[PDB]
Amino acid sequence: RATFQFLPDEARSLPPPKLTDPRLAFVGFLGYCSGLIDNAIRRRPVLLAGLHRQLLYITSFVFVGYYLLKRQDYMYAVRDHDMFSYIKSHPEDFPEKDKKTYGEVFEEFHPVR
Amino acid sequence: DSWDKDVYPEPPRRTPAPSPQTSLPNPITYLTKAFDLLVDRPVTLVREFIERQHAKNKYYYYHREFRRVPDITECQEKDVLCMFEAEMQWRRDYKVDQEIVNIIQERLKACQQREGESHRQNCAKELEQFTQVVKAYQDRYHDLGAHYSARKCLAKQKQRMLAERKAAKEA
Ligand SMILES: CCCCCCCCCCCCCCCCCC(=O)OC[C@H](COP(=O)(O)OCCN)OC(=O)CCCCCCCCCCCCCCCCC
Numbered sequence: 695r696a697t698f699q700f701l702p703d704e705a706r707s708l709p710p711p712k713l714t715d716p717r718l719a720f721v722g723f724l725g726y727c728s729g730l731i732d733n734a735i736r737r738r739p740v741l742l743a744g745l746h747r748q749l750l751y752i753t754s755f756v757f758v759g760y761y762l763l764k765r766q767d768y769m770y771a772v773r774d775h776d777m778f779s780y781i782k783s784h785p786e787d788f789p790e791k792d793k794k795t796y797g798e799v800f801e802e803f804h805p806v807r
Numbered sequence: 808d809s810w811d812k813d814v815y816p817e818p819p820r821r822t823p824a825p826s827p828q829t830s831l832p833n834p835i836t837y838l839t840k841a842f843d844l845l846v847d848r849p850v851t852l853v854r855e856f857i858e859r860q861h862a863k864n865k866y867y868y869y870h871r872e873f874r875r876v877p878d879i880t881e882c883q884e885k886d887v888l889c890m891f892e893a894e895m896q897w898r899r900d901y902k903v904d905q906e907i908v909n910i911i912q913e914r915l916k917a918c919q920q921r922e923g924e925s926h927r928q929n930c931a932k933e934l935e936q937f938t939q940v941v942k943a944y945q946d947r948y949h950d951l952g953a954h955y956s957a958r959k960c961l962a963k964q965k966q967r968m969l970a971e972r973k974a975a976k977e978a
């Protein structure tokens with residue numbers, strides 16, 4: 695909500711992404727793939743070379759990805775909060791219907807002959 | 808024996824007694840005795856042995872009972888949770904009805920073979936029962952298509968019921 699803010703303060707009333715979040719694991723896997731591609735384009739032993747460099751690729755991807763997921767989760771909470779508050783404010787636009795059973799509702803039968 | 812005689816009836820057996828009008832020996836009579844001694848006897852003992860093993864390990868299995876849930880008639884439209892149970896029930900009853908028609912067809916085929924050249928008159932009851940059950944099955948399930956469902960079955964029934972009302976209205 696707050697102008698030009700990545701994580702408005704109201705977002706702290708939401709639970710943070712777990713560090714075992716499957717999306718965070720995928721992001722970390724992307725960091726690992728980036729490390730391997732880095733070795734490959736420089737003709738270094740792909741798996742073994744420069745493990746410190748590979749570690750930083752994983753850690754930096756996870757670090758940024760954690761805050762993106764935190765903001766992603768927040769923005770969908772805001773979408774739900776806005777939509778339900780609007781439904782409360784305009785009941786006549788969202789009437790609760792009378793539900794009829796299939797014994798009462800007429801549906802045409804189309805034979806497959 | 809093993810199956811219910813009521814579900815799978817078989818008229819009483821009437822075998823005539825031998826009345827040989829020839830002095831010759833009957834080859835079938837001595838072949839039957841040889842079959843009993845050389846085939847039935849050793850086979851029977853092997854089975855009696857196996858039955859002695861099955862009696863030492865007796866354990867049971869059960870026939871699943873399905874409690875009745877509300878039909879699709881009682882389901883509010885687009886209420887998947889109640890629709891799902893009614894739909895699953897309808898599919899279970901559909902398979903059972905298929906097997907019912909198979910039982911009636913198996914009675915009919917057994918009668919035709921059993922009665923020989925007199926089947927056209929001696930199997931009139933089985934023909935009638937087969938005709939009635941096939942008519943009922945056709946009304947319930949025919950022409951629904953590959954994507955059949957309880958919803959489509961209900962629509963077929965309602966269409967049939969509407970025509971029956973109109974035909975009576977003519978009377
Ligand atoms: C649990 C993991 C399951 C794997 C999931 C894979 C998902 C796709 C990830 C794409 C990124 C792959 C890593 C970047 C490529 C680095 C590997 C390479 O370029 O060369 C192979 C290299 C061996 O050759 P070398 O250069 O001599 O290095 C010696 C190191 N021992 O390195 C090696 O020794 C082997 C390294 C892995 C080889 C990767 C081959 C590329 C596969 C691309 C196909 C697309 C992926 C499949 C599509 C479905 C995605 C789930």
Ligand SMILES: CCCCCCCCCCCCCCCCCC(=O)OC[C@H](COP(=O)(O)OCCN)OC(=O)CCCCCCCCCCCCCCCCC
Pocket residue numbers: 721724732746747748750751754755757758759762
């Ligand atoms: C959207 C969901 C998915 C999330 C996407 C997130 C994308 C953004 C996340 C950041 C992506 C970049 C991560 C780069 C990791 C590799 C960095 C590395 O290994 O550098 C090793 C070394 C330099 O390390 P050094 O700068 O000295 O560390 C001290 C920093 N004060 O020197 C080297 O040999 C490295 C050479 C390879 C680097 C390629 C060129 C880029 C230069 C990077 C400089 C250092 C980057 C530090 C990353 C920190 C980011 C938090």
Ligand SMILES: N=C(N)NC(=N)NCCc1ccc(I)c(Cl)c1
Pocket residue numbers: 768769770772773
């Ligand atoms: N369609 C537009 N031009 N506006 C628009 N994005 N409407 C949709 C509303 C929306 C969607 C996602 C989030 I997260 C939030 Cl907070 C609000």
